[PDB]
Write a protein that binds this ligand. Structure first.
Ligand SMILES: *[C@@H]1O[C@H](CO)[C@@H](O[C@@H]2O[C@H](CO)[C@@H](O)[C@H](O)[C@H]2NC(C)=O)[C@H](O)[C@H]1NC(C)=O
Length: 383
């Protein structure tokens, strides 16, 4: 009924599926971006193709989604508003963070695109739809696609489509890549970062940032875990770090978490501002997933098969999504707007005893504060 609710439910559904084939590895994706890519496809899907997407991504009760409203694509700044409003806001230039989104549908050129659709994507989406020749120059097409994604992500997301992933039979490809970097409200000082061991299960040294400051923390003895909120500068986004008490307690947490639990654990009465010592590793997160495998296991299957019904995009028989890929990159480091002086810090050094030390596997979420929507979610087992 709200983007906050829908993005979190969708996020945890995706998490449940990635857990299957990604045990003991880092996991990192952008739920909001995946929903936007699927919303774009949803615009031209019909029959069961459309129903499966709506059911799995839950566009159902969302503002801007639904029968009458969507029929107005091309005009009306209301279509898919609940999603577009967040993406439109976070992709704008600003002085505290950078969020680059490269999302696009590449369709074989031989497929005549329905003109009402082009207008549709043209007005609601940037990347949109782009014609291309897979038929006789597949390796050439793959180069074109990967070079667009690379160029659009500051040279960060490279070779998104693997060789042999595209051939003379490819109908349409969905690429959805995102890069995020944000400044903390409260910076960590470079001089305070030290090599510290991270107990992966055994351990390895990692660059561990450190600072003492006032932060919202939730302590849940009942679940043997703590949650720390670190605000990004600007007051529009924050990062939640869910840290189990024991080095090997992640599995339990991952089994119990969902939208309801996350909401309860972070409510204003459970969260409390406390002077605390924070240890957080510098992290360079980057993962890429085959969305076809993920979404199919989640319940979206027709759109990827000859039985797909995208008669809203074209009229040609056989238009289906032949490959769909998601890649997300984000660096977590010291950069911030303000810092405590060496004098106050000195006083805290031996007076503050409470600490939040993320030196073992944890879960983390970057959220949009106003909507409560999930922008990124991940599991960090190796910083
Ligand atoms: C991604 O996962 C899918 C399903 O597990 C793999 O299967 C492909 O499915 C697409 C439909 O979107 C077909 O067009 C391909 O011909 C299928 N390829 C095969 C033989 O598996 C798909 O291969 C995976 N993508 C890659 C290259 O990793």
């Amino acid at each position: 009924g709200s983007i906050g609710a829908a993005s979190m439910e969708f996020c945890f559904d995706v998490f449940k599926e990635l857990k299957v084939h990604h045990a003991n590895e880092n996991i990192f994706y952008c739920p909001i971006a995946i929903m936007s890519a699927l919303a774009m496809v949803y615009l031209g899907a019909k029959d069961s193709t459309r129903t499966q997407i709506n059911k799995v991504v839950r566009f159902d009760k969302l503002p801007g989604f639904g029968d009458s409203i969507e029929a107005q694509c091309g005009t009306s700044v209301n279509v898919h508003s609940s999603l577009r409003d967040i993406l439109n806001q976070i992709t704008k230039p600003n002085d505290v963070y950078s969020f680059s989104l490269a999302s696009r549908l590449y369709a074989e050129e031989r497929y005549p695109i329905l003109p009402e659709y082009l207008q549709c994507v043209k007005e609601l989406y940037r990347g949109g739809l782009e014609p291309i020749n897979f038929q006789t120059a597949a390796d050439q097409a793959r180069e074109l696609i990967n070079s667009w994604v690379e160029s659009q992500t500051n040279g960060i997301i490279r070779n998104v489509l693997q060789p042999x992933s595209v051939d003379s039979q490819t109908a349409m490809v969905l690429v959805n890549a995102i890069v995020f970097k944000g400044l903390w409200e409260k910076a960590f000082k470079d001089e305070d970062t030290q090599a510290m061991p991270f107990r992966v299960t055994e351990s390895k040294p990692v660059q561990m940032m450190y600072q003492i400051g006032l932060f919202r923390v939730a302590s849940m003895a009942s679940e043997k875990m703590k949650i720390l909120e670190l605000p990004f500068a600007x007051g529009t986004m924050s990062m939640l770090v869910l840290l189990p008490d024991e080095v090997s307690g992640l599995e339990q947490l991952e089994s119990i978490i969902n939208f309801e639990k996350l909401t309860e654990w972070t409510s204003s009465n459970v969260m409390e501002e406390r002077k605390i010592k924070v240890y957080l590793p510098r992290m360079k997160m980057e993962e890429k997933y085959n969305l076809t495998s993920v979404l199919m296991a989640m319940g979206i299957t027709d759109v990827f098969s000859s039985s797909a019904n995208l008669s809203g995009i074209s009229s040609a028989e056989x238009l289906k999504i032949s490959q769909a890929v998601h890649a997300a990159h984000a660096e977590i480091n010291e950069a911030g707007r303000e810092v405590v002086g060496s004098a106050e810090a000195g006083v805290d050094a031996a007076s503050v005893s409470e600490e939040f030390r993320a030196d073992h596997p944890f879960l983390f979420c970057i959220k949009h504060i106003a909507t409560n929507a999930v922008l990124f979610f991940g599991r960090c087992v190796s910083p």
